[PDB]
Design a binder for this molecule. Sequence first.
Ligand SMILES: OC[C@H]1O[C@@H](O[C@H]2[C@H](O)[C@@H](O)[C@H](O)O[C@@H]2CO)[C@H](O)[C@@H](O)[C@@H]1O
Ligand SMILES: *[C@@H]1O[C@H](CO)[C@@H](O)[C@H](O)[C@H]1NC(C)=O
Length: 434
Amino acid sequence: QSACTLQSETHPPLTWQKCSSGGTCTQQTGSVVIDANWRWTHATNSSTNCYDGNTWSSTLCPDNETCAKNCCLDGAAYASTYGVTTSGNSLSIDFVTQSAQKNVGARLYLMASDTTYQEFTLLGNEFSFDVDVSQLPCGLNGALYFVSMDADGGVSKYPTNTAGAKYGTGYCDSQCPRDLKFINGQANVEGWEPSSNNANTGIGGHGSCCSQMDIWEANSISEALTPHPCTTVGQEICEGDGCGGTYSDNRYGGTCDPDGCDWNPYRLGNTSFYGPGSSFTLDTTKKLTVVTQFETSGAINRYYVQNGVTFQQPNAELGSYSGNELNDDYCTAEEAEFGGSSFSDKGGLTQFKKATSGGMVLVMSLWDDYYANMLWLDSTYPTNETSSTPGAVRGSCSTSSGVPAQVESQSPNAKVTFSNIKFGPIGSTGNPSG
Ligand SMILES: OC[C@H]1O[C@@H](O[C@H]2[C@H](O)[C@@H](O)[C@H](O)O[C@@H]2CO)[C@H](O)[C@@H](O)[C@@H]1O
Ligand SMILES: *[C@@H]1O[C@H](CO)[C@@H](O)[C@H](O)[C@H]1NC(C)=O
């Protein structure tokens, strides 16, 4: 797709810290850009929509190639249309914003410049950030993660994509998302199936896969840390159901692991660690600091800080595994106790190390789940399972919670705030910022 300028594209600024082993942290200046799927897509020579509701213009978009040549992406009014605002080192995203249209959530990327994505090499480093999840009830997910996206949004590989990173193109993740309107410089109109439960989305014949590091997926009830390997580290297109993931009939038929080696404290047995109120170790009605460390062995460590007190990831006992570190032993034990083979089939942490050794793009979003109502995160799932089944209970939300239409009308004012992002070698982000 190309880019049009009926609406100016001004990326909201966002500062973060880059720290060194020497003990100092220096301020960096970046900005955020909203994903292409959220933008107005119209004809290059007029205001005629190429996509409206959940269907494509059959004349402007008779196929993927022609559609890409005839259509462009436009600018976004971040605050008034998407409810996305920043202030210094802080970023806030509102759940539902009502303007000339109704908007739900947003997916944003951190930029190095006005035309490129900031890449982060996680291996050997740690990532810290503060978060306020107090306004996120059951069914919502304020996410912060990394994906192996190209820094230019794909422009160099796909010449027909001239909008690039400036317009948020090139997304990919371990679900090999088929809901993307533009993949590899082409539209996704061929094989498009509108959603039976969502008036603004659909499923195309193509998906976009790549490694994904889910550092933070949570609401005020539950939180999870999950690495997802793919046999092909970087962004790569897939065909229909061969994609696997959430948008396909066969979830495990693709090249990526849609489940991952997840770590949710509640699911592991500690139901008193994270929750709303002073009865939990970490009170989700108050802001907290989350630190994630990627050691060279390929294992992942985690600690939290709230009101000056530090808490390491709680100890978990799963099979012959005991500890608080996400490593090969934990992931093997989880597959044994909870079931599954997706993570190990895709190479596990060894294959995942290939992704963290390379560049990854930072993504921040707020979303509701039209496929599983976020039950996999904060409730009992599958809903037919009981508490006797190992790993079924992931949170205290009712199995009837998370219906999109319901949460959108009952909690329109929900929101999430990410702030004070710090990155640098292991053991350095706790030092004085600059
Ligand atoms: O596809 C939705 C959601 O799935 C998450 O994986 C679940 C999986 O769906 C479930 O069958 C299994 O029992 O548990 C895993 C871990 O919670 C996946 O981690 C999410 O990224 C994804 O959005
Ligand atoms: C949960 O984790 C916290 C912090 O590690 C710990 O203090 C508490 O005792 C744990 N509770 C249970 C029931 O395991």
